[PDB]
Design a protein around this ligand. Structure first.
Ligand SMILES: *[C@@H]1O[C@H](CO)[C@@H](O)[C@H](O)[C@H]1NC(C)=O
Ligand SMILES: *[C@@H]1O[C@H](CO)[C@@H](O)[C@H](O)[C@H]1NC(C)=O
Ligand SMILES: *[C@@H]1O[C@H](CO)[C@@H](O)[C@H](O)[C@H]1NC(C)=O
Ligand SMILES: *[C@@H]1O[C@H](CO)[C@@H](O)[C@H](O)[C@H]1NC(C)=O
Ligand SMILES: *[C@@H]1O[C@H](CO)[C@@H](O)[C@H](O)[C@H]1NC(C)=O
Ligand SMILES: *[C@@H]1O[C@H](CO)[C@@H](O)[C@H](O)[C@H]1NC(C)=O
Ligand SMILES: *[C@@H]1O[C@H](CO)[C@@H](O)[C@H](O)[C@H]1NC(C)=O
Ligand SMILES: *[C@@H]1O[C@H](CO)[C@@H](O)[C@H](O)[C@H]1NC(C)=O
Ligand SMILES: *[C@@H]1O[C@H](CO)[C@@H](O)[C@H](O)[C@H]1NC(C)=O
Ligand SMILES: *[C@H]1O[C@H](CO)[C@@H](O)[C@H](O)[C@H]1NC(C)=O
Ligand SMILES: *[C@H]1O[C@H](CO)[C@@H](O)[C@H](O)[C@H]1NC(C)=O
Ligand SMILES: *[C@H]1O[C@H](CO)[C@@H](O)[C@H](O)[C@H]1NC(C)=O
Lengths: 172, 319, 319, 172, 319, 172
């Protein structure tokens, strides 16, 4: 969509991922793995909760009856009330329809953004030592065991430490 | 090379919502913003309510039999029902609606005596089978049907004035009897021209009882026209009359503020609520509701949508 | 090196719109959201309309000559014009505007006969040169000007009651004649105090014809005060009178729903529309319009803007 | 703008491009060419259409006259009507002005986004075989004839096939 | 390696605002959108204002002593104060509020003479010590208290018509005297039934002075009820009366448009403003204000927020 | 946030920077320096000003009193007015609340975007002669004196001039 990741260059979601909203999935000599990203998932959830906290919990103002439900009244003043009340209903239904439409547009685009941010984070972390597949993956030009994969997942991966050889295998 | 891949979650269990661009977007989850459920009861927990049952608010001020339990009181909430009784002897009040509203917005009523005395030749305790109590004929509790003490006798020219010595305005109601026959007029009052004038500093009017036949209600073919004003603190209101006045014995003081509810729903003392309508009570944290534009209290705003889903997840792209 | 370059399109014929940031953004294309065009006509295609021409809605209910073609009917759309005629013998109706509105929202009227009979000493066919038909003097078609059959004679005390035996409420109109001279009163009715009382179970009122001089219209210096109520199904309405009543011969039943249009625009049976105003008819898919806050039907919302362009292309950056 | 492409690092639009909204333009030994991108152009158009379908052809609710055009009405009740009507006009004009403003902000920023997405697509396709000019162009460090250019335009370009030469020319 | 780093600014001096996702966002700066300050004065610079002081708008039309300076004039702005005087002889006008409003929106009044003459047996210069000018008793400047020239004598049946020969509608006010005693009625008018009818082509009404005992104000126990209409251009309005009418000597033409302000704030001729309320004047470029829903002119919209900050900087991330 | 720069990969602001909103800061053999970017700072300020010019300065419509401040009006018509006015206050307070919320969301995200656009600008200028640190900095693989640093800040830096050396230091 806006940020080109969700329903963009990442072709689809993972239904197996239930620990979080965004996450990682790897393959190296020791096999395959899956793991969720805490920071990005929490970033997205908190902003949805923010939205929910604003639409729930508002304090309403007091209103009294200006009609009678039972001793239906007089006609001229009634028509003025019906008019005014329908005119207001149009206003609130429209606003509601707009509010939700635009909040939704924003939620969807926000979620796309947090996915892109997670991509960009990792791309910069791998420095010269990987290449982008174009599908949401990075191909790592050095041998990256399960601890190395974890380093990438908690932003502790040291570029210096594998640069020598990454470059060497990129030189081909 | 070894591979690390980035991805997001999805569900098979997808939900459809609306955006600026698209009327059908699958998202992973979503939540309703329009309330559609109401409780079929009136949630009165922790309110001083008054359920009028068969009593109509106006009957509280004139003292109809149906309203005997409700002639005085304090409340923060008043409940009216649909075929409540206002009148025993048939009649109508001028600006009935305004009067009905002032009471429903009042939070309590006290009755103050007028102290009007009449003296002999007047029988001030007229009764009718239209206003029964126990046993026998009665009349509105807050008014007196004044009548010549002797059947054919002319009714005396009389004058009564009520003085508001409180520091709050008082509501006075009175009636004017429109009898059904020249015979009935002659028997209750004179054979003389009848005339009633009422005057305060802020109010002034004259009335003439009018003889004539009208459908029996049901009961009687005569009628009473009720009229009312507010008497300001310190003001006097005088009645000049020679037959036909239905005089006030007590006036009313309306006390503060209260929520007036019109509903047929039955009361429940173990839920609480700040929003009510004819169909009962609405209790929700959602900003909008589906149930009625006509609601009272602190209510979500009425909308014309069955449903409005707010996305609480990302765009859903399954495998 | 060989090169591949990515780019977007542009146009030489750019358009300006507003954003949150900028009041003049060139974009490649844009579309209007505020309707500014109206049709000079009333688009009545596929509607059962009724054009009242010179007839005023109230004249349909009392039966003014100008309204003879419109005393009954069904329609889904009623059209009023600006100097339509309501009265032949000069007068005014109480709550005219409410009455005018009930009819304009009605979608049809049927006339039901009252069946009132009078007996001799009453001449129930008074006519006047103010209400001409063919040939000679006439009166409102739905009412009867009752008068002493003998010029000087006192008008008899009379009683007529109408009973609603339908299952819908009926509208009753009646008049009260206020004559121009004590001579004219004496000749039409007695030399006696006149009094007219009207009573149902839900309505009650008394009237007194009042003698006095008023500008000739056009015609007469007397006047008629028209009064009306709804009679509920099963209810009776009684008239007690001794001169001065202008009695109903037919009552009205208003039937369903219709759209009432006030306009001078002429009708056109080849276009359709759901929206109308004084200046004619508005037919558009745009959500807003420019033309009037005073519109009827299913209308776009009125706004105070000449134009509001919605961008339908990207930002325009020419070469 | 928001995504920095349209009226950002791409200096200007192409008026010669009339087949689509976004597109390609190349230069190699055999000359120059121009061609539109379908997938990106369609992406943008569909979302504008979506917007138009929401605002146009909504169903309105019925209102009757509460005033008379012809018989002036009680002055007190008239003033209450004028007040309420003007109050409602202020509300609708403001909303309309807001609606259009924000939809336009979004349309423009959307269009910028689709342009960026098309850039990012091609960048990832060329892997290490090209470099970004900074002006919207990619300089290709191998000889890319018309069939090669088409391969990039229909996502069939295999970077592997030209990688060894590209890297060699990058290293000089 | 050498390096170049990109960054943004921050401040220690941070500000909190609200967004769609967060209720506390620090930003570098922000600005208020809700006006909370008002000026304690009425900013009248470059307006033709009229400050009525002790005069009530209605007194301008009937000619109360307090309003002698304001019987005519032009203005674009009218200022009412809180205990302004409308009536000298106690009374009330029907649809007082509508009348008050028409004048406050009028931008000027001119007085046109009725030319009513009465002839002997009528004394048309009744005065009272309730309406003092000096020396001595007076009456409303725009009306005449007509009375039998001889104390006990019956008041003659009389007819006066006023004809609008202008091309603008004129406002006619008249009064009806409700005397305190049958003795007072007898002395001012006949011992006869009183009746006053008023009739034009588009207006028609009848009145009956009514006698009765009432409190004194201030002053008197009698009363006057004022009634009014518009007379259309070319139309005639006739008064038929035999005692009790308080007749117009002058009618009023309301001229154009003006802004009516109700306030006790004192005037200031050095500031300008387009917005006013009871507490004074509001002058701001902000779209919303905090001060009152009850405002007049071109005003920002009233809201129930103390404050709404609009971010004018980026998110604030300190060192 | 949305664009991942402000309160994203740039860990904090500079309080010493008072010349502008975004800017540069360097370190080479001759020491350190700080300088603001005109184009990006101006881009951000102008859009805030645009927003302010739409909300301030609006022309209002004229309203008359429909209430009396001084004289008690009929209770029925009063209640209808109170209702309508409270009904309209609810509308305006809600809209104001929404307006500000969403404009603020946009202002914040706009500002983030301009910071990203400045990053991207410089990244493209340095071509293959530098590498991204991941926290907002570029490490330059050639010796870049004060004139070279200015060339980057004024968009006159020619990568070709330092390319051979840069690549050599990237490769060992
Ligand atoms: C669905 O969204 C709601 C929003 O309140 C949330 O509470 C719930 O945890 C979500 N459930 C799933 C299955 O995502
Ligand atoms: C009547 O009212 C006035 C005040 O309006 C008061 O001065 C006076 O005491 C009252 N009359 C009597 C007899 O109490
Ligand atoms: C010019 O542009 C307008 C919209 O701005 C469009 O309606 C029209 O078809 C275009 N015509 C030409 C010749 O470009
Ligand atoms: C302008 O927009 C309308 C729909 O909004 C469309 O019908 C038309 O194609 C557009 N004009 C051009 C030149 O694209
Ligand atoms: C009058 O109407 C009542 C219904 O309220 C009905 O019971 C009664 O029979 C009617 N009287 C006559 C004479 O028809
Ligand atoms: C791209 O697609 C076309 C069909 O549109 C296909 O025939 C062609 O072979 C493809 N391009 C190349 C360079 O093979
Ligand atoms: C602090 O911030 C305010 C805005 O909130 C600004 O106008 C002012 O100049 C600043 N003051 C100082 C001392 O930096
Ligand atoms: C804070 O706000 C206003 C503009 O919104 C500006 O004039 C003022 O100087 C600002 N203060 C600073 C330090 O930027
Ligand atoms: C009275 O006014 C009418 C207009 O309704 C006019 O025709 C007539 O001439 C006026 N009276 C006289 C005597 O002219
Ligand atoms: C609105 O009021 C009118 C009377 O003016 C009444 O006929 C109608 O029933 C009311 N609306 C509804 C939904 O009943
Ligand atoms: C609104 O009603 C007033 C009377 O209260 C009237 O003077 C005015 O003309 C009406 N508005 C318009 C635009 O005519
Ligand atoms: C950067 O631009 C300025 C113009 O202000 C120019 O004088 C300067 O020479 C440029 N940079 C270098 C390194 O020369």
């Amino acid at each position: 969509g806006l940020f080109g990741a969700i329903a963009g260059f990442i072709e689809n979601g993972w239904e197996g991922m239930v620990d979080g909203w965004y996450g990682f999935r790897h393959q190296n000599a020791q096999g395959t793995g899956q793991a969720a990203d805490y920071k990005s998932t929490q970033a997205a959830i908190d902003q949805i909760t923010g939205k929910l906290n604003r639409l729930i919990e508002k304090t309403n103002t007091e209103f009294e009856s200006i009609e009678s439900e039972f001793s239906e009244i007089e006609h001229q003043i009634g028509n003025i009330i019906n008019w005014t009340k329908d005119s207001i209903t149009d206003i609130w239904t429209y606003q509601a329809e707009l509010l939700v439409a635009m909040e939704n547009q924003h939620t969807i685009d926000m979620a796309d953004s947090e996915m892109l941010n997670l991509y960009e984070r990792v791309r910069k972390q791998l420095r010269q030592n990987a290449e982008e597949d174009g599908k949401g993956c990075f191909e790592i030009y050095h041998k990256c065991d399960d601890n190395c994969m974890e380093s990438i997942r908690n932003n502790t991966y040291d570029h210096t430490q594998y640069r020598e050889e990454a470059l060497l295998n990129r030189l081909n | 090379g070894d591979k690390i891949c980035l991805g997001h979650h999805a569900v098979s269990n997808g939900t459809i919502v609306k955006t600026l661009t698209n009327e059908k977007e699958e998202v992973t989850n979503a939540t309703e913003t329009v309330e559609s459920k109401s409780l079929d009861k009136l949630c009165m927990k922790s309110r001083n309510y008054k359920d009028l049952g068969s009593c109509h608010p106006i009957g509280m001020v004139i003292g109809t039999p149906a309203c005997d339990l409700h002639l005085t009181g304090t409340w923060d909430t008043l409940i009216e029902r649909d075929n409540s009784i206002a009148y025993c002897y048939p009649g109508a009040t001028v600006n009935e609606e305004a009067l009905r509203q002032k009471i429903m917005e009042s939070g309590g009523i006290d009755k103050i005596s007028t102290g009007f005395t009449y003296g002999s030749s007047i029988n001030s305790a007229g009764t009718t089978k239209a206003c029964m109590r126990n046993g026998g004929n009665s009349f509105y509790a807050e008014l007196k049907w004044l009548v010549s003490k002797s059947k054919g006798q002319n009714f005396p020219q009389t004058t009564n004035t009520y003085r508001n010595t409180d520091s709050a305005e008082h509501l006075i109601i009175w009636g004017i009897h429109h009898p059904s026959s020249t015979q009935e007029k002659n028997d209750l009052y004179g054979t003389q021209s009848l005339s009633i004038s009422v005057g305060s500093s802020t109010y002034q009017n004259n009335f003439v009882p009018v003889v004539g036949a009208r459908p029996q209600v049901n009961g009687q073919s005569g009628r009473i026209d009720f009229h009312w004003t507010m008497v300001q603190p310190g003001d006097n209101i005088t009645f000049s009359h020679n037959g036909g006045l239905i005089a006030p014995s007590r006036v009313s003081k309306l006390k503060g503020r209260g929520l007036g509810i019109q509903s047929g729903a039955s009361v429940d003392n173990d839920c609480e609520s700040k929003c009510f309508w004819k169909g009962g009570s609405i209790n929700t944290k959602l900003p909008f509701q589906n149930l009625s534009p006509r609601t009272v209290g602190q209510c979500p705003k009425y909308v014309n949508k069955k449903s409005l889903l707010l996305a609480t997840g990302m765009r859903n792209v399954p495998e």
